[PDB]
Amino acid sequence: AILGLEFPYEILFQLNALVHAQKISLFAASDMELIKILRGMSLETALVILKKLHQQSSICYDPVFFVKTQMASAYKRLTEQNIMSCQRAYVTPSKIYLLGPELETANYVVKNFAEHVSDFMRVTFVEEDWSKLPANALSVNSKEGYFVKPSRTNIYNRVLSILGEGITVGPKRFEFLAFSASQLRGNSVWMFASNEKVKAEDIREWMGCFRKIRSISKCAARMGQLFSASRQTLIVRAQDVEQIPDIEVTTDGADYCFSDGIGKISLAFAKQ
Amino acid sequence: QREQTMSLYLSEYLSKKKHGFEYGSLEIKNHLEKLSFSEIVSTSMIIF
Amino acid sequence: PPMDYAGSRPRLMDHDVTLEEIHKFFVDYMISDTLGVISTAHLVHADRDPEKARSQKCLELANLHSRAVDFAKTGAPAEMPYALKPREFPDFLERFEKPTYISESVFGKLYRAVKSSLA
Amino acid sequence: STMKFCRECNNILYPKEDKEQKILLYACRNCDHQEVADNSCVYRNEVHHSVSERTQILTDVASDPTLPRTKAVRCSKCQHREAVFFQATARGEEGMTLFFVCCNPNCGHRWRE
Ligand SMILES: [Zn+2]
Ligand SMILES: [Zn+2]
């Protein structure tokens, strides 16, 4: 509300990440002169000077003097090597840390949703030292009554509230889409900012119908399994399908199935 | 004798499954135990 | 003969997911997650006693490791016991703060050989 | 089990069915008075199995059985093999799940299958 203008989201995110880093304090970047100067300027040169200021290890007390002295491709990158810019956020019990547009590999969702690249944000939950949260920091054990009953801590409620409401950075609010199997061990989750054209529910119903599964872990696993990096190829219709019986043998009262994930392919299809 | 105590032992093929003996004993108890209909009904009435 | 691959019974709800139980499961994955410590405890126990991977302790460790691996798909905690923790670490580990004990197994011989080669 | 008294005779009424009227009526055998019935209810009793009065204390009727005990499962927090097992539904899950509660007086730990 302090700005009250049409300031771009990308420059605001870069400035906020710079403030989060140990380079510029909050009051040094909240002045009117900096935003007035950075509001009207070429985008490419502004990004170049911002990254030049961010890359320096020294703490810049007055960025105004520094910035005064200083003075399409996404689609082809995705089709060639699946190169996308993702925003990585670290949520700590004390504050938040934003890494920035770190280049990484692309998944299947961004192939068909290559317009809202900045809307996707990878959010991980770590400790103050950016380490894995220990078991004693969440739901410490206590003996009340006859049996031991765990008691939830304030960090547990904080994580629940963050996952429910979402992170509001500027003119955006990131919801919860899903988390992959690899990110479950790494305590990471994807977030997507709702937009007029597409929202979180739109992508959720576009990926598939998850009301058939009545299990909690299984539904999350099947929703997040479609996030591994893969290379695009031709599209196959639904009319070229067939059902072939599998094999199953029960010996000594144990169900042993040979065909778990096996399949067949032709030579022409393999060449294609 | 009226009590007529019996004794039934479980089979040895249930050890293959995890906790097979407990599930087998519970299923047998649920199968061959008498449960009267009065213990299930709460209110009985006759309506014209 | 190999160990049995019979997993835990699936947990099916009587209603649809209200988008909150998935968050609860995700948060609860941080706690009762002993996937990384079971392997270390099994390695230490195999290093300590002779005739390794033959006693019931190693079988229980393998069962707990399998259950922990299956925890990602089915919500069954591993429930690592307290008395099964190693409390001792061999020389070929980065746990300098933890008490380090001299290992005389094949891994200890390999570590001694590589230390003598580098020095 | 529902008894009512006539307002004119102050005597017990007996239920009856009329073929022509096809309605429920109450009439007493002392006076010729047939009143109208309400709710069409002639019997109502709460099903209770307390037929053995003043006898359930001396004789062990075993109305509440004890849970079984097993010595095959081993507890986690303590190395005690004795535990009680029973089947009960979860908070929201559908079906029966086997539970285990440690019988060690100093442990007090419970876990699922
Ligand atoms: Zn009368
Ligand atoms: Zn116990």
Swiss-Prot record, chain A:
Subcellular location as annotated: Nucleus, Nucleoplasm; Nucleus, Nucleolus; Nucleus
Effect of gene knockout: Late flowering and absence of siRNAs derived from FWA tandem repeat regions. Loss of de novo methylation. Increased expression of retrotransposon-derived solo long terminal repeat (solo LTR) and SDC due to their derepression; levels are even higher in the double mutant rdr2-1 jmj24-1.
Subunit details: Interacts with NRPD1 and SHH1. Associates with Pol IV complex, forming an interpolymerase channel bridging their active sites, through which the Pol IV-generated transcript is handed over to the RDR2 active site after being backtracked, where it is used as the template for double-stranded RNA (dsRNA) synthesis. Interacts with JMJ24.
Function, as annotated: RNA-dependent direct polymerase involved in the production of small interfering RNAs (siRNAs). Binds to single-stranded RNA (ssRNA); engages ssRNAs longer than 7 nucleotides and initiates internal to their 3' ends. Able to transcribe the RNA of an RNA/DNA hybrid, the transcript produced by Pol IV, if its 3' end is accessible, to generate double-stranded small interfering RNAs (dsRNAs) precursor essential for establishing and maintaining DNA methylation.
Family per record: Belongs to the RdRP family.
Miscellaneous comment as given in the Swiss-Prot or TrEMBL entry: RDR2 is non-functional in the absence of associated Pol IV.
Protein name: RNA-dependent RNA polymerase 2
Native organism: Arabidopsis thaliana
Name of the gene encoding the protein in the UniProt record: RDR2
First and last residues shown, out of full length: 285 to 567 of 1133
Curated annotation (Swiss-Prot), chain B:
Tissue expression: Mostly expressed in flowers, and, to a lower extent, in leaves.
Gene (name only): NRPD1
Null mutant phenotype: Blocked in the perpetuation of CNN, CG and CNG methylation in repeated endogenous DNA accompanied by a reduction in long 24-26 nt siRNAs. Transient loss of post-transcriptional gene silencing (PTGS) in young leaves. Reduction of heterochromatin association into chromocenters, coincident with losses in cytosine methylation at pericentromeric 5S gene clusters and AtSN1 retroelements. Altered cell-to-cell movement of siRNAs beyond the vasculature. Release of transposon silencing. Not impaired RNA-directed DNA methylation-dependent (RdDM) silencing.
Family: Belongs to the RNA polymerase beta' chain family.
UniProt organism field: Arabidopsis thaliana (Mouse-ear cress)
Protein name: DNA-directed RNA polymerase IV subunit 1
Subunit and interaction comment: Component of the RNA polymerase IV complex. Interacts with NRPD2, NRPD3, NRPD3B, NRPD4, NRPD5, NRPD5B, NRPD6A, NRPD7, NRPD7B, NRPD9A, NRPD9B, NRPD10, NRPD11, NRPD12, RDR2, RDM4, CLSY1, CLSY2, CLSY3, CLSY4 and SHH1.
Superkingdom assignment: Eukaryota
Classification of source organism: Eukaryota, Viridiplantae, Streptophyta, Embryophyta, Tracheophyta
Full-protein residues shown: 920 to 967 of 1453
Record function comment: DNA-dependent RNA polymerase catalyzes the transcription of DNA into RNA using the four ribonucleoside triphosphates as substrates. Largest and catalytic component of RNA polymerase IV which mediates 24-nt short-interfering RNAs (siRNA) accumulation. Implicated in siRNA-directed heterochromatin formation through the action of DCL3 and AGO4, and subsequent DNA methylation-dependent silencing of targeted sequences. Essential component of a self-reinforcing loop coupling de novo DNA methylation to siRNA production.
Record localization: Nucleus
UniProtKB/Swiss-Prot annotation, chain D:
Pfam families with a match to the protein in the record: Zn_ribbon_RPB9 (PF02150), Zn_ribbon_TFIIS (PF01096)
Compartmental location: Nucleus, Nucleolus
UniProt GO cellular component terms: nucleolus; RNA polymerase II, core complex; RNA polymerase V complex
Residues annotated as binding Zn(2+) 1: 6, 9, 28, 31
Keywords: DNA-directed RNA polymerase, Metal-binding, Nucleus, Transcription, Zinc, Zinc-finger
One Gene Ontology molecular-function label: zinc ion binding
Binding site for Zn(2+) 2: 75, 78, 102, 107
Superkingdom assignment: Eukaryota
Transcription keyword on record: yes
Changes seen on gene knockout: No visible phenotype; due to the redundancy with NRPB9B. No effect on methylation at RdDM target sites. Nrpb9a and nrpb9b double mutants are embryo lethal.
SMART domains: RPOL9 (SM00661), ZnF_C2C2 (SM00440)
Chain positions of all zinc fingers (TFIIS-type): 71-112
GO BP annotations, alphabetical order: DNA-templated transcription
Record family assignment: Belongs to the archaeal RpoM/eukaryotic RPA12/RPB9/RPC11 RNA polymerase family.
Note from the entry: Pol IV and V functions are not impaired in nrpb9a mutants and Pol II functions are complemented by NRPB9B.
Subunit structure: Component of the RNA polymerase II, IV and V complexes. Interacts with NRPD1.
Function: DNA-dependent RNA polymerase catalyzes the transcription of DNA into RNA using the four ribonucleoside triphosphates as substrates. Component of RNA polymerase II which synthesizes mRNA precursors and many functional non-coding RNAs. Pol II is the central component of the basal RNA polymerase II transcription machinery. It is composed of mobile elements that move relative to each other.
Protein name: DNA-directed RNA polymerases II, IV and V subunit 9A
Gene: NRPB9A
